[PDB]
Amino acid sequence: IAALVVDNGSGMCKAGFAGDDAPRAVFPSIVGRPRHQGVMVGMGQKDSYVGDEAQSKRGILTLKYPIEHGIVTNWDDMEKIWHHTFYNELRVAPEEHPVLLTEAPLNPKANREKMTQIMFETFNTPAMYVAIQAVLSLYASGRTTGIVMDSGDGVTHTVPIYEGYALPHAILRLDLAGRDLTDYLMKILTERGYSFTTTAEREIVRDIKEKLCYVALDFEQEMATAASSSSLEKSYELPDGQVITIGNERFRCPEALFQPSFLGMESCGIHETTFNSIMKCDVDIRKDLYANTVLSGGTTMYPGIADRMQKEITALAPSTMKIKIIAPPERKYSVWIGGSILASLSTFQQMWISKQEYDESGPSIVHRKCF
Amino acid sequence: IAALVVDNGSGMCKAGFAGDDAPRAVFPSIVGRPRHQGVMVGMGQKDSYVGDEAQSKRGILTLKYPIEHGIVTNWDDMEKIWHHTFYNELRVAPEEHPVLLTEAPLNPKANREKMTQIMFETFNTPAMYVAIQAVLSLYASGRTTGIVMDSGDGVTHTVPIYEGYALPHAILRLDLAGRDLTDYLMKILTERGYSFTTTAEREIVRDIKEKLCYVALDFEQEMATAASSSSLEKSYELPDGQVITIGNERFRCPEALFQPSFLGMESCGIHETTFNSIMKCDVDIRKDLYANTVLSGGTTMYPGIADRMQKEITALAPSTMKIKIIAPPERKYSVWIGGSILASLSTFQQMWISKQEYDESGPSIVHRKCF
Amino acid sequence: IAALVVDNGSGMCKAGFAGDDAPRAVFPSIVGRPRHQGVMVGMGQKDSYVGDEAQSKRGILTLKYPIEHGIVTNWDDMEKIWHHTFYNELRVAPEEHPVLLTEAPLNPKANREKMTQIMFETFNTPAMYVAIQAVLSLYASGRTTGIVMDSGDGVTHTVPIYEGYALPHAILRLDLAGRDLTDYLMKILTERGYSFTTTAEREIVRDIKEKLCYVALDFEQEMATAASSSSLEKSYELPDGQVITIGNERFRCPEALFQPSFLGMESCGIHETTFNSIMKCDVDIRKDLYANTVLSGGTTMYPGIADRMQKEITALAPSTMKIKIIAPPERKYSVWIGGSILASLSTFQQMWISKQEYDESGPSIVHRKCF
Amino acid sequence: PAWXAXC
Amino acid sequence: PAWXAXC
Amino acid sequence: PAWXAXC
Ligand SMILES: Nc1ncnc2c1ncn2[C@@H]1O[C@H](COP(=O)(O)OP(=O)(O)O)[C@@H](O)[C@H]1O
Ligand SMILES: Nc1ncnc2c1ncn2[C@@H]1O[C@H](COP(=O)(O)OP(=O)(O)O)[C@@H](O)[C@H]1O
Numbered sequence A, B, C: 001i002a003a004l005v006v007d008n009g010s011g012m013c014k015a016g017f018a019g020d021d022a023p024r025a026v027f028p029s030i031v032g033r034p035r036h037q038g039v040m041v042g043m044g045q046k047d048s049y050v051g052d053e054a055q056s057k058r059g060i061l062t063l064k065y066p067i068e069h070g071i072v073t074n075w076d077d078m079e080k081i082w083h084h085t086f087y088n089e090l091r092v093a094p095e096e097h098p099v100l101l102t103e104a105p106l107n108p109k110a111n112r113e114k115m116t117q118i119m120f121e122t123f124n125t126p127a128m129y130v131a132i133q134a135v136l137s138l139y140a141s142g143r144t145t146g147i148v149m150d151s152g153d154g155v156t157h158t159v160p161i162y163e164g165y166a167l168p169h170a171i172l173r174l175d176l177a178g179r180d181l182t183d184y185l186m187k188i189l190t191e192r193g194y195s196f197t198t199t200a201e202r203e204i205v206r207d208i209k210e211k212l213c214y215v216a217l218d219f220e221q222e223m224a225t226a227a228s229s230s231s232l233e234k235s236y237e238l239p240d241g242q243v244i245t246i247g248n249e250r251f252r253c254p255e256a257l258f259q260p261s262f263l264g265m266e267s268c269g270i271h272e273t274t275f276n277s278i279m280k281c282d283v284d285i286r287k288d289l290y291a292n293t294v295l296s297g298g299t300t301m302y303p304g305i306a307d308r309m310q311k312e313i314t315a316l317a318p319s320t321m322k323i324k325i326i327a328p329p330e331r332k333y334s335v336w337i338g339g340s341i342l343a344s345l346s347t348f349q350q351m352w353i354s355k356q357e358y359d360e361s362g363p364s365i366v367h368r369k370c371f
Numbered sequence D, E, F: 001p002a003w004x005a006x007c
């Protein structure tokens, strides 16, 4: 029987059967409820909505994500997301197929346990595993010595791995991520008098993000240029037809990744959390890992981010070192891709937690290989 | 069939077939293990790397030397070194060829016993001998009367050998060796703030020693120059790309061979132990030794050590002597070369203990031929 | 005139006049800077803050300790600390009193030289000395035969000093310390749900570390005790008054002192560095050293540490030997207590380097009687 | 927020 | 990391 | 330490 690979990421839940090169489902990891009372009763309007149904009814809904910073904050609305993930998006019975779930590093032990409880006892999965999302991005690139910088909506993490052994004492998780980068775009859009406050409006600003922010190679030069002339400014039509315009804000939004001080956090930028991670491992295991900075997750999609990472971390690293930023196509979806690859291995059939194990061991089984 | 010759050196294993003019296998005598949990199971890791493998994978492994000062401290580690020596490095079935083992002087009876047992019973060698390393050293220069000053990673020793017969009562051992000089090199590099602690870092320091240290001819004037101009000081770059400056430290490290007080050892310096072994020799023969002081083993490779040994032991000898220090090239692997020479010969073809002899007489054959 | 004794600890500075039995001033050694723009022009605010002023303003400053692992990583923030040590905390003019500083074993030679130049040419001291931290302690213990395990926020040292004559070759410096365990406490607290990131949160973690954490007498058994029961659960209120319930965490946090493999350092536990330091000494003195094992510095204050130490070295050491972990109350400032004694011990009155000597022999004068 | 304490 | 090279 | 009673 084929396995199911599901990444419960903070923005979207990528799901599908193993061995395939892309996920069959890519729906926003959102649940929604009505904000107003109903009248046209012949509709039979639903007790709740999910995914692109939530994008379809979007303007009349309170929206929430049950996953934040990688913690599942609401197990009821997360169970809704899984119910839809299987029984509507893939039409599979999960009780007949093993499942590989993906999880963030340095996340509370209870989340692995509460996930596993729901999977074995609600959804009756025959077997399960809870893979570290970083390890999967390395499998996804085929390499087996490198440092994975993974960042989507909820978490940024850097995990170095060498000859396939972990370096767990060198993992850094910076909670500056895509959701936060969206919050910050809302604040700075307010500077030009464009206002966005409802959860539906928040996701319009997510859309602006996707298609309008680049990560300038030098912030002083570009900010000087954008203060000097209007040539760089681009416009975007709302669903209500009027054209917003983005100027300095285009590159300020992801500049935060290299200056988290704009968002009030003390932490050093994603270049610095990469450099500080390579410096946490042995001198040997280093020049190698400076030739292998591997990027993943949707906030690694900004134009020029690989250039900026290089021209930043090369200024931190020693001279006469080769620094290269392996930023693949489909870095958007590497982990599904990595999970698909891991589910293809014969030996991984020995790694699973089976329901027969869970029923005899109790919750502590979920922790054998984790960060 | 050609006998197999193995130099069980404390730092490096030199090995080959009899009649090779130089060893085939030359590798650091390291057994490694991983410092961290393995996570990419599809790599197919192996539990203990050996030789150049361990040195390739350096920073993910703990590194064990199984031999300390000629004493085999860990036998299953050393057994793995010999397994790798035979099946992989030389590619031979050691049960089908006789075997020549080198051993350090004044090394306990049990070491020879356990070497014997492992050869005759793990590897089932058909015939075997264990040679006093200095014999082989003298033979390697083609001469047959002199005194050897051997100085490896683990042992420094002085052996007078006349008409090819050793003087056993006149042998000296000094454990101040290449590892100890690596130790002191750490400590003195720490003065300039270059810390090195992990075994991996130890290997970096070994590399540094092997290329920037040298024996000062004239310590006082040198150290006065080093306190007067920066011209004596120079640099090296880590596997981590960054440069390190080696200075006063260059000469201060190898000075220890003449001044063991610098490592808090009350034991006499190498010039004193050579003298004090010549003066243990019968009054007639001392002249014949002074023309025939042979140096062997890798810590005799320091530039100027011959010049220093000469200019020092000059002062310990009476005036009107031909105090000549025999320090050729190939002193590096000399001990092994001598093994190959001696192994090729029908007179030595009488000496090899037959497996059957040991099998019938137990350890009682080796308890003689160790003297 | 009365001299001044100042201990430049990596975490907290202890200072006062000679003769007294406790150091009058304890500014936790921190400099901190405004994390945001100052807005109320009427507040009379200042550029940067130190010690308890830094603690008072904590929630709006980025905090930097200018000593790490004993190295003075920043000289301007150290010199700010000394300016506040003398003119604010002690209200004394250091250009009118001799001064004694303290320094770690094996610290880079350059540190002593810079310190000296700052004392003689910023603070214009009449005469100066820099005592090796461990040494001072045995004076504080009275006993002039013993091995000192000093463990503070930064370094850890295990000097054995005998019959009052040192043994410098036997000194071992292990860079596992209180800061390292604060940093590890952040990682393990994450597992139950609590996020700590900022520099200010590092001090809250430090408070949790100084109150609820303690050393297991046997890790496995106490581990098992958690796994069976809530009996070790205790709780601490953050500045929010919300209680955080920590457990299995107390006897894990400092278990790192005995298992540095938990934190990805390579070197052996503080018990093993204690035993191994004794084993560097000449075989006679060992009986007396086992009976005179001395603990000092704030990280030796964990409850249970003595019991664990005594049993741990009783495993490593011989049977038919007696082990005395001399660990008094007030072990913490058992340095500015030893320095008080040393400056009071009037035979020492020749040792203070005069400014006139330093003005002639330059920085070379500091290497008078140190390691 | 989300975190059990600290955010 | 405090030292020069090395940590 | 190698030695049985010495190193
Ligand atoms: N082309 C793009 N440019 C910038 N950001 C993007 C782009 N595509 C996606 N993102 C950001 O990535 C975030 C989610 O990343 P991803 O890792 O794919 O999802 P998840 O974090 O749920 O696994 C989204 O919030 C989105 O804003
Ligand atoms: N160029 C060099 N200068 C100084 N020492 C060297 C040099 N090359 C090798 N060595 C030393 O030689 C030692 C090992 O020599 P060798 O005798 O071949 O191995 P073993 O001592 O194990 O038999 C090492 O400790 C190393 O420090």
Ligand SMILES: Nc1ncnc2c1ncn2[C@@H]1O[C@H](COP(=O)(O)OP(=O)(O)O)[C@@H](O)[C@H]1O
Binding pocket: C008, C009, C010, C011, C012, C013, C151, C152, C153, C154, C178, C179, C206, C209, C210, C211, C296, C297, C298, C299, C300, C301, C302, C303, C332
């Ligand atoms: N009761 C306690 N138990 C364990 N550790 C403590 C305790 N109190 C303080 N510490 C630790 O001791 C550290 C300070 O060490 P100390 O010896 O006082 O100064 P220094 O670090 O300069 O040597 C603090 O960072 C703190 O974490």
Ligand SMILES: [Mg+2]
Binding pocket: A009, A010, A133, A151, A152, A153, A297
């Ligand atoms: Mg993700």
Ligand SMILES: [Mg+2]
Binding pocket: B008, B009, B010, B152, B153, B297, B298, B335
């Ligand atoms: Mg040798």
Ligand SMILES: [Mg+2]
Binding pocket: C008, C009, C010, C133, C152, C153, C297
């Ligand atoms: Mg201290």
